[PDB]
Structure formats: structure tokens, C-alpha cells
Amino acid sequence: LMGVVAQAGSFNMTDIVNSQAHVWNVIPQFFGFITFAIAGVAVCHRHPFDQPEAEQELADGYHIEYSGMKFGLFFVGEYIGIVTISALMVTLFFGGWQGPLLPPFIWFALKTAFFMMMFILIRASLPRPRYDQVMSFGWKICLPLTLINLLVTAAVILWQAQ
């Protein structure tokens, strides 16, 4: 997320969607986009990063021993988490409420649902990895790449400093 903040210059979301007035942030920072998508999937405990107890039999899911409205709260909380991660992703990498002809809230809802169908698709496509490449990827490939992305975006925003 500091990739987008460094490109924009402030934390405020209105400043993000006003700094995305000419180009959307997905094309200068695609590495930041994919890393934020993977991190949002894993924090939300969605399908590829789901049931980490599947590789072991001394471990069971934490979702058990709940019944009724508590397990239901866990389920709907996961889903509001994934839809707010979709909303954050569109308003931080695509154009926040920005469109040619349709109303801005209609555009935001359409792009959010577009991200929801993309999440359904990546759920339907990618199989579950096991735990060891999950840790190995999420450290070794994920953290140096976003650090290098921050360095490169710093270099390019300081090169065209006028």
C-alpha cells in the first residue's frame, strides 16, 4: 500500500482518487497490485489460504466448536472483509468512482462487483497450495518484491520531480 501512498503523497483516500485523475494506479504499479491482492486474500482467509490444518492431522480448524450465530458471524465477517478488500483495491489501483458517462457510485459498484467476479474466478481456477510454498512465497517472493517496488517508484517519482 505504501507503493500507492508514495505515488500519491498522502494517506487520505480522496487524495488517492484525485491523484488517479489522469492514469489509474494499476498500470504503473502492477507488482503492488498483485501483492496487495494476494495479501488481501490471505488476511481475509479466503480459499487458497484456507484450512491450513489440511496438511496435518494434529490440527483442526478454528471454525469448529462454534455453532449457530457465532459461526455465521465468522462467515459474514469474512465476506464483508473480502468485499471491503475489493473496494480498497479498486479505489487504490483502479479509478475510484471515475468514469466517462455512468454515475460515480454506479461505476464504483460495477468495478467492485467486477473484482468480486474476479475473486470467484481465481477461486475456481487456482488449486490449494500446501503450507511450505505458502510461507516460502509470502516471505521470499513477496517482501523483497514490494521493497524493490517501493524503491523503483521512489526513483521514478523523484526523477520526474518538477
Which residues are at the interface with another protein (CB under 8 A)? 55-58, 63-68, 71, 130
**Residue with smaller CB distance to another protein, 67 or 162:** 67
What are the helix (H) ranges across 21-103? 30-43, 69-93
Task: Tell me how far, at minimum, the Cβ of 67 lies from another protein, in Å.
Answer: 4
Report the b/e string of 10-37 with b at 16+ CB within 10 A.
eeeeeebbebbeeeebbebbebbbebbb
Q: Tell me the CA end-to-end span of the chain in Å, nearest whole number.
A: 24
**Residue with smaller CB distance to another protein, 63 or 154:** 63
Task: Tell me how far, at minimum, the Cβ of 56 lies from another protein, in Å.
Answer: 6
* Amino acid found at 155: A
Task: Tell me how far, at minimum, the Cβ of 66 lies from another protein, in Å.
Answer: 7
Task: Tell me how far, at minimum, the Cβ of 44 lies from another protein, in Å.
Answer: 21
**Residue with smaller CB distance to another protein, 15 or 55:** 55
**Residue with smaller CB distance to another protein, 27 or 58:** 58
Handedness of CA 123, 127, 131, 132 (dihedral sign): negative
